[PDB]
């Protein structure tokens, strides 16, 4: 009976909660109390990247740590030479409501998507001099909110149809559809080894998925409301989430629980972007109050603020060699920090 | 102090900047409008009429471009989105106006429509965004209340103790009953509006049948008023 199934679900959920309660023998604070506080970090706007007409929702660093793709709601992707602030490419988009972008690890492609429900893929390195649309991937019902290239032929898209998908770029069709969320999936972070990935939705729950077997492997809870950003710790055995309940939270896949929560009483805006440094000792979060906060992830004290932006910080990305951090906001500007 | 290839790279960047300025010059000259409504609300027919008079399977948004009096408008409506709205609505907190088409010839889903309008009005991101609500399908409502089969008073008890405000203007000449009922619905929506307007944003009621060709001019006039208000706030004239 339906009552029987519901009772079984409650029983298994209680069993999971009990196992999680048993496994938590010490807080990360209790063990991290030993670690010396990082200290205040002052990061300065080394470069300011002007040229976007409207607000920015997305940016992705290149694996060469110098090029930079940025997505604005005016209908542009701009590829910056971050060292010299030159504009390398200016890619006009077919739908202006872009709200994600990715930069292929090889550097031959960038992706973008938004309210059009499409993940368009752009070919940067053509024999002709221009940047052309390589493929348009269709099949999601809700909007696209994040995309991340696994390699030059496989991309993973999260959507607001409660579904993340894995695509074959050569043969447009989907290869795996990841179902199990009950709200809009907002962010997405591929693991370093690219065999797994996590996605946070609008149901306050995040899930570690399996790219090859196609099935959700874990589910994590603890947030009070919908999750806006997610990112892997450089280890690959953890991830941090920022949500509209004004908190960041650090889950761990092996313990399958929550480790620490990054919150302050005076901060009531929702986190919009989360990214780590190389060591993982600094958790950088972009908030709605126009400032990105810097959190010492091991002990959850505020270590830095980067209040240069006027309007809300929508995107935030740390480069692969850890040299710089870039922040894009709704004031049409990108800021590179050291 | 920098090599010749860097001269040419800087020249390339400068041409890109010039193109970006040429794009800004037209980005400031177009106004963005978000269209909202329900399945029974005739907003699709409104879009069709606006496209016809002025100026692909699961695509999630339909941008319609129209102009009037040499001013360019871009009206966007979500086509393949889900029922949830609290996230992809944060993307529209800088549009000129929000057009909310409601079908007022149901009496049944109408309370759901008021709930939706209230959810839109009080949204933490849609402040300072005026709403242009279109009470759609008025002639259907007129005929359906001439029929008299469905009593409005049972769906809404307060309609019995209601009378037409003095500010009415029935132009063609119709039954005072239809005017009283339609102004009652308009006044329900306006009560929801003025409950928390606080002068930051406004609501512009209209009586619209999707066959009407004056919809675009109504949007234009309301947008002109909204721009005038934000300029009065901006040039510090108020």
């Amino acid at each position: 009976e339906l009552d029987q199934l519901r009772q079984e679900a409650e029983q298994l959920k209680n069993q999971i909660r009990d196992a999680r309660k048993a496994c938590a023998d010490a807080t990360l604070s209790q063990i991290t109390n030993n670690i010396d506080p990082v200290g205040r970090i002052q990061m300065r706007t080394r470069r300011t990247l002007r040229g976007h007409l409207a607000k920015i929702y997305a940016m992705h660093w290149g694996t060469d740590s110098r090029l930079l793709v940025s997505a604005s709601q005016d209908g542009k992707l701009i590829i910056w030479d971050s060292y010299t602030t030159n504009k390398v490419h200016a890619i006009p988009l077919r739908s202006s409501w872009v709200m994600t972008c990715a930069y292929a690890p090889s550097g031959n492609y960038v992706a973008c998507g938004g309210l059009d429900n499409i993940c368009s893929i752009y070919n940067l390195k053509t024999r002709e001099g221009n940047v052309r649309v390589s493929r348009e991937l269709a099949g999601h019902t809700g909007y696209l909110s994040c995309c991340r290239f696994l390699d030059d032929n496989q991309i993973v898209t999260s959507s607001g149809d409660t579904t993340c998908a894995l695509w074959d770029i050569e043969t447009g069709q989907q290869t795996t559809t990841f179902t199990g969320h009950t709200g809009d999936v907002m962010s997405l972070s591929l693991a370093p080894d690219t065999r797994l990935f996590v996605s946070g939705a609008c149901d306050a729950s995040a899930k570690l998925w399996d790219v090859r077997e196609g099935m959700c492997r874990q589910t994590f809870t603890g947030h009070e409301s919908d999750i806006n950003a997610i990112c892997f710790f450089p280890n690959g055995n953890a991830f941090a989430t920022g949500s509209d309940d004004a908190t960041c939270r650090l889950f761990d896949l092996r313990a399958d629980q929550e480790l620490m929560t990054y919150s302050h009483d005076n901060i009531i805006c929702g986190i919009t972007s989360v990214s780590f440094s190389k060591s993982g000792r600094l958790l950088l979060a972009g908030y709605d109050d126009f400032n990105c906060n810097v959190w010492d992830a091991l002990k959850a004290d505020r270590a830095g603020v980067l209040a240069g932006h006027d309007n809300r910080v929508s995107c935030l990305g740390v480069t692969d060699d850890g040299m710089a951090v870039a922040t894009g906001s709704w004031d049409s500007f990108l800021k590179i920090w050291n | 102090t920098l090599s010749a290839e860097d001269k040419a790279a800087v020249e390339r960047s400068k041409m890109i900047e010039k193109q970006l300025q040429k794009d800004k010059q037209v980005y400031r000259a177009t106004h963005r409008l978000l269209l909202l409504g329900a399945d029974n609300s005739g907003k699709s027919t409104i879009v069709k009429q606006m496209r016809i008079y002025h100026v692909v399977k699961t695509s999630g948004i339909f941008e319609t471009k129209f102009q009037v009096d040499k001013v360019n408008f871009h009206m966007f409506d979500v086509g393949a989105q889900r029922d949830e709205r609290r996230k992809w609505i944060q993307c529209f907190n800088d549009v000129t106006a929000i057009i909310f088409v409601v079908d007022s010839s149901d009496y049944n889903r109408l309370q759901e429509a008021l709930n939706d309008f209230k959810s839109i009005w009080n949204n933490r991101w849609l402040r300072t965004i005026s709403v242009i609500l279109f009470l759609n399908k008025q002639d259907l409502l007129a005929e359906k209340v001439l029929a008299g089969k469905s009593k409005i008073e049972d769906y809404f008890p307060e309609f019995a103790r209601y009378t037409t405000p003095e500010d009415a203007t029935p132009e063609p000449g119709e039954d005072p009953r239809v005017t009283r009922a339609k102004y009652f619905i308009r006044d329900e929506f306006l009560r929801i509006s003025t409950a928390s307007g606080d002068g930051r944003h406004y609501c512009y009621p209209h009586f619209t049948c999707s066959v009407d060709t004056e919809n675009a001019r109504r949007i234009f006039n309301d947008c002109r008023d909204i721009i005038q208000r934000m300029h009065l706030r901006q040039y510090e004239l108020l």
Partner: single-chain antibody
Framework: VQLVESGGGLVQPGGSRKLSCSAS????????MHWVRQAPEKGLEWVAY????????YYADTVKGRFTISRDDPKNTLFLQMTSLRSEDTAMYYC??????????????WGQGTTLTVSASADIVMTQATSSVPGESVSISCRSS???????????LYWFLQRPGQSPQLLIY???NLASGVPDRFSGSGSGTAFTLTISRLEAEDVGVYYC?????????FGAGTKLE
């Protein structure tokens, strides 16, 4: 990509000619294009240069007022105007394509060339001392006067291979980067003044004349050429 060029022939001295370079198959307006010439039996020599947007124009010291370079982007052609032709202007003129941004490969395409016949300083000099040399390994060398390594970290040295019957093709740009389409056999190295190009295993299609070029500062001087037989 293809660059077909025309407008050359027998010319009486003191006359004038206008060369053209009709381009098809690439975004012409975003490429800065050069004219390079070579005397019937000598090495290549740079002539002029016009930039994207037509804002930067350079000329050789030997054509500084005699010549005039101009482009027509909508018509997608490149022109070179020549006045008061002398007997040192007998050469085949090449149309070269070059785009400049981070990571780009300038001089990556060369046109087939046009022949022009005329009837009867403080710039970097690069010398290829060797003038001649299947399955073996060859190590064509090169030398320069001023150091080519810039403060950027780049070493603006280019390698071109001219097969016995056609136009040069780019093999290595900025001393280390193999161009698109060149096999993995070719590789380049250097230090700032002395450079070398390595072919790991020859083939019957690797025979020709190897030319070097510097892009550090205009004019672009080339080098005599190394022959493989």
């Amino acid at each position: 990509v293809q660059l077909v060029e025309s407008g050359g022939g027998l010319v009486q001295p003191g006359g004038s000619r206008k060369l053209s370079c009709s381009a098809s198959g690439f975004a012409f307006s975003s490429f800065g294009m050069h004219w390079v010439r070579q005397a019937p039996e000598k090495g290549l020599e740079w002539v002029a240069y016009i930039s994207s947007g037509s804002g930067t124009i350079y000329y050789a010291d030997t054509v500084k007022g005699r010549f005039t370079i101009s482009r027509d982007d909508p018509k997608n052609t490149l022109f070179l105007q020549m006045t008061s032709l002398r007997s040192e202007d007998t050469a085949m003129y090449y149309c070269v394509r070059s785009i400049y941004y981070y990571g780009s490969s300038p001089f990556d395409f060369w046109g087939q060339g046009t022949t022009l016949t005329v009837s009867a300083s403080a710039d970097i000099v690069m010398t290829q001392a060797t003038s001649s040399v299947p399955g073996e390994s060859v190590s064509i060398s090169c030398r320069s006067s001023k150091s080519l390594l810039h403060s950027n970290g780049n070493t603006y040295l280019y390698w071109f291979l001219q097969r016995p019957g056609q136009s040069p093709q780019l093999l290595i740009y900025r001393m280390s980067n193999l161009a698109s389409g060149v096999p993995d056999r070719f590789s380049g190295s250097g230090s700032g003044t002395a450079f070398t190009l390595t072919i790991s295993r020859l083939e019957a299609e690797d025979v020709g004349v190897y030319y070097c070029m510097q892009h550090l500062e205009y004019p672009l001087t080339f080098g005599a050429g190394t022959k493989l037989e």
